[PDB]
Design a protein around this ligand. Structure first.
Ligand SMILES: N[C@@H](CCCC[NH3+])C(=O)O
Ligand SMILES: N[C@@H](CCCC[NH3+])C(=O)O
Ligand SMILES: [Mg+2]
Ligand SMILES: [Mg+2]
Ligand SMILES: [Mg+2]
Ligand SMILES: [Mg+2]
Lengths: 296, 296
């Protein structure tokens, strides 16, 4: 299978005056490129995918593709939806506009059965000829892609090559790679990046890397080389920031940190997302002082 | 406050050859009207709101309004979204096209904070002058509107008059009406319709009423008239069907039952929803046999 692995970033989507700041978006990519990141994910959960229009979603994918041309960095485009017809539409757009692959979150809100999840992802995978990474995040979607369904999809669909797990379930990570060691398990939870990688996971799709791309990149590449002492030391050092970046729903803390670091101009979200509490704003600022944040 | 209460049905959306069957939709609503229902909810969770287009969503609202015109039966239009700007757009459409009020599910997938939920619903409520019913279903959305937030919205926003609770939490139902007895608590879980009504809830938004509108409307009306003995009797009798209609994610079992009863032409879902397993198909059919199903 064709694959997209390594250190990857779930890009925030900056706003200015309520619209996507397209110049800031491109500048934030490139900063990721220049700090060792292997792939970028435009318009995932961290990118406020649910509140962008379909037009804005597509614009962000195009900016990511244009910014990564001439580099090794790959574009793994967010293309998920609760509706299969909408997910297929985004998948085809990403393919026709030069993305290297797609990420596709399990349908949220409507809680499809495992049979429905299989048919959902089969239709997505059959619609394009680029790699497809599944994405399981039950705390957000209200459903789980079972290990059996993930493995069936990997084995049955040529371009489905693995899963991004955000489920706090290392047992399932063992289950997945013990029964199907050819898949690419990707960590979707920064605090446990190292345990997932050390069980044979092959990359991360990170929130923390928005702020600390060099540290997440080094952690991942140490682990892929089986330099587990060095990978664990970075994972341990990052624990405090990894947890404070979820003191409120992601991406509220990460955008707060990017603003405090002067990496975005305004602390702007699209409703129903909004600024953190005053107390949490101060907690994020405090934890940040313990880390070296690269500029532009 | 202007209110919409009583026995209400979360209408299924029948499909024919992948498109909304608009004549079937009107026929099913007339059947609800002839069996005592007080209001209908077009395009809620049970109506596959997540996979309809915005244009099909609007068409179903218009059919409900037209079919109910000249009856006493109100239309409480589904108008929720994870994106506040989309929810405001649906609310304004429902107002402009003659709906009596709107239902608005808590934003799913992006997990807004309580402050965000407050600002989301404030924006919706300020955009129209018709009643607004909140809707809490954390197993689907991944978030919970707290009792404090619900009560604040009820008190601060003239249009917001209550909440549809689908949370399996009778403690919260007591909390709500003990601290704010003026709100309209609406049951969103059929199996516990009577316990919610007997604590002072003032209506139901039912799945089961798609199949048995006469039984759900009688249950509600007994309870509102303080005949708890007869209300509980129907609630008890309905437990088996109320539970089997959730053996797979709603609306998979209810559409299966409507098809088995000859009330819709074809067992058609929009992906990622799909037919139940053969075992669950047979179990739904078996449970239905103990109930008398009204025809057209
Ligand atoms: N609010 C809709 C539309 C998002 C479209 C852009 N990804 C949803 O969550 O599916
Ligand atoms: N699939 C999108 C669009 C649905 C529009 C009609 N309710 C969502 O879940 O928000
Ligand atoms: Mg290229
Ligand atoms: Mg996605
Ligand atoms: Mg009546
Ligand atoms: Mg709704």
């Amino acid at each position: 299978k064709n694959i997209i692995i390594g250190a990857m970033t779930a890009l925030i989507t900056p706003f200015k005056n309520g619209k996507v700041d397209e110049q800031s978006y491109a500048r934030l990519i490139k900063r990721q490129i220049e700090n060792g990141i292997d792939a970028v994910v435009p318009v995932g959960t961290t990118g406020e995918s649910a509140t962008l229009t379909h037009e804005e979603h597509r614009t962000c994918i195009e900016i990511a593709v244009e910014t990564c041309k001439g580099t090794k960095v790959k574009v793994l485009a967010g293309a998920g939806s609760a509706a299969t017809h909408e997910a297929v539409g985004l998948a085809k757009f990403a393919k026709e506009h030069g993305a290297d692959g797609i990420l596709s979150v399990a349908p949220y809100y409507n809680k499809p059965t495992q049979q429905g999840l299989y048919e959902h992802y089969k239709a997505i995978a059959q619609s394009v000829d680029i790699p497809v990474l599944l994405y399981n995040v039950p705390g957000r979607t209200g459903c789980e892609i079972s290990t059996d369904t993930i493995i069936k999809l990997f084995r049955d669909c040529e371009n489905i090559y693995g899963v991004k797990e955000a489920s706090g379930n290392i047992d399932k990570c063992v289950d997945l790679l013990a029964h199907e060691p050819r898949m690419m398990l990707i960590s979707g939870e920064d605090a446990i990046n190292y345990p997932i990688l050390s069980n044979g996971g092959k990359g991360v799709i990170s929130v923390t890397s928005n702020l600390l791309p060099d540290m997440i990149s080094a952690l991942t590449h140490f682990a892929l080389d089986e330099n587990y002492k060095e990978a664990k030391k970075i994972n341990d050092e990052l624990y405090n920031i990894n947890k404070i970046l979820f003191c409120e729903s992601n991406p509220i803390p990460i955008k707060t940190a990017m603003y405090l670091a002067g990496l975005i101009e305004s602390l702007e979200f699209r409703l129903p997302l909004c600024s953190p509490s005053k107390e949490n704003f101060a907690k994020i600022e405090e934890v940040m002082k313990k880390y070296k944040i690269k500029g532009f």
